[PDB]
Antibody, heavy 222, light 218 residues
């Protein structure tokens, strides 16, 4: 079918430009109508532009005309959106979307999105601390342990446990914005309490804006 | 704001039928351009729900249907289920200047009558690694509560404390309950100089309090 992968989140300065990529697999790019739709945090969907197969032309939305460029590399099945003269109102998740060009549909498939943050503040990778299991985090046959992902910027951070081999009973919480203007979040996993002496637990933290990954071993409190 | 207009919110009880309208103009829906609908579940990307006014993509249940008449379109959900809590967006095309894709402003759907659920609260003390870095953070994690309103208070020993507390707004989980977290920032000397700290979570008149103490290695 169609699968889409996008470039990673990043912070850009006001007045700068951003270039977001979208790599397509399953269908060749020539068979697809590519579009870009953004969503500012807590707001609705805004179409930026995309391919009109009836005229065979890429058309931009009025509000971005003169600031946006959409291009493609069909040798690599990759589409690109570049947005210039960035401002606060451009902080948003940018989705590539596509529909088969044989249809008029623009968004049968949505990419995973790329969060672009427009700010004068610089990128900061996280400091990761273990949240060790103890008698005060146990619930009989299960126990809670976690990771504290401190003082990063911009969003997002993702967390997995044991490389994704633990999924049931993972909960990664939304981040807090601290007085410093930096974010923190936590992730917890519930595991068997009998296990804790012998099993290895690792939180896998990904901060794409800083090109940082941290695998933090979480050991029982001693 | 939006070129297409939707209600901000709709609600119904499980098993009932609810409708979401989408009104446009003679340059979009009234020009006979198709209307598609997208569902955005809490924490996810939008996904196609209805296409070409009334058709279901593979995988969408037959409880979802759509229609169009004149300048308006409507999404109907029968047999409403708690998993249908989501934001719903209509989409069409508008020829006022050139080709364009236009969206509705979205509708938040609430499923009424969901049972109250008390919070699960876990409180972690500062890690040894963080203390050795001359910092200290208490972490209060609050999950699986319903409805979404929760109050969080902290105590140092028995006395209320506000300095250093930073708390997130409740956020809808994928299971329709809510999560929040609260962080108390202290110096290592403050952490070591009290007998205990507590996080108190109040939800629908009842309170869950967890405590940690620097003299525990538990």
């Amino acid at each position: 079918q169609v699968q889409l992968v996008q470039s990673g989140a990043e912070v850009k300065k006001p007045g700068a430009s951003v270039k977001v990529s979208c790599k397509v697999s399953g269908y060749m790019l020539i068979e697809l109508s590519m579009h870009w739709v953004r969503q500012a945090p807590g707001k609705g969907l805004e179409w930026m532009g995309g391919f009109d197969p009836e005229d065979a032309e890429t058309i931009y939305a009025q509000e971005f005309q003169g600031r946006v460029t959409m291009t493609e590399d069909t040798s690599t099945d990759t589409a690109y959106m570049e947005l210039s003269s960035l401002r606060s109102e451009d902080t948003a998740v940018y989705y590539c979307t596509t529909g088969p060009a044989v249809t008029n549909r623009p968004a049968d498939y949505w990419g995973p999105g790329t969060l672009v943050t427009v700010s004068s503040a610089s990128t900061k990778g996280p400091s990761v601390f273990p949240l060790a299991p103890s008698s005060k985090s146990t619930s009989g046959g299960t126990a809670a342990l976690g990771c504290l992902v401190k003082d990063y910027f911009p969003e997002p951070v993702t967390v997995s446990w044991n490389s994704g081999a633990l999924t049931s009973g993972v909960h990664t919480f939304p981040a807090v914005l601290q007085s410093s203007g930096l974010y923190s979040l936590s992730s917890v996993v519930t595991v068997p309490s009998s296990s804790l002496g012998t099993q290895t637990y690792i939180c896998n933290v990904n901060h794409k804006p800083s090109n940082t990954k941290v695998d933090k071993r979480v050991e029982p409190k001693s | 704001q939006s070129v297409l207009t939707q209600p901000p919110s709709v609600s119904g009880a499980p098993g009932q039928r609810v409708t979401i309208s989408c009104t446009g103009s003679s340059s979009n829906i009234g020009a006979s351009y198709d209307v598609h609908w997208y569902q955005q579940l809490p924490g996810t990307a939008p996904k196609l729900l209805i296409y070409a006014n009334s058709n279901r993509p593979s995988g969408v249940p037959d409880r979802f249907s759509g229609s169009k008449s004149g300048t308006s379109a409507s999404l109907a959900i029968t047999g409403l289920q708690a998993e249908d809590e989501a934001d719903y967006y209509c989409q069409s095309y508008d020829s006022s200047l050139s080709y364009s894709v236009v969206f509705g402003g979205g509708t938040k759907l609430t499923v009424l009558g969901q049972p109250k659920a008390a919070p699960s609260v876990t409180l972690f003390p500062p890690s040894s690694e963080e203390l050795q870095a001359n910092k200290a953070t208490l972490v209060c994690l609050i999950s699986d509560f319903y409805p979404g309103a929760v109050t969080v208070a902290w105590k140092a020993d028995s006395s209320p404390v506000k300095a250093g507390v930073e708390t997130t707004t409740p956020s809808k989980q994928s299971n329709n309950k809510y999560a929040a977290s609260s962080y108390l920032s202290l110096t290592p000397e403050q952490w070591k100089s009290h007998r205990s700290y507590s996080c108190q979570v109040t939800h629908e008149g009842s309170t869950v309090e967890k405590t940690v103490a620097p003299t525990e290695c538990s």
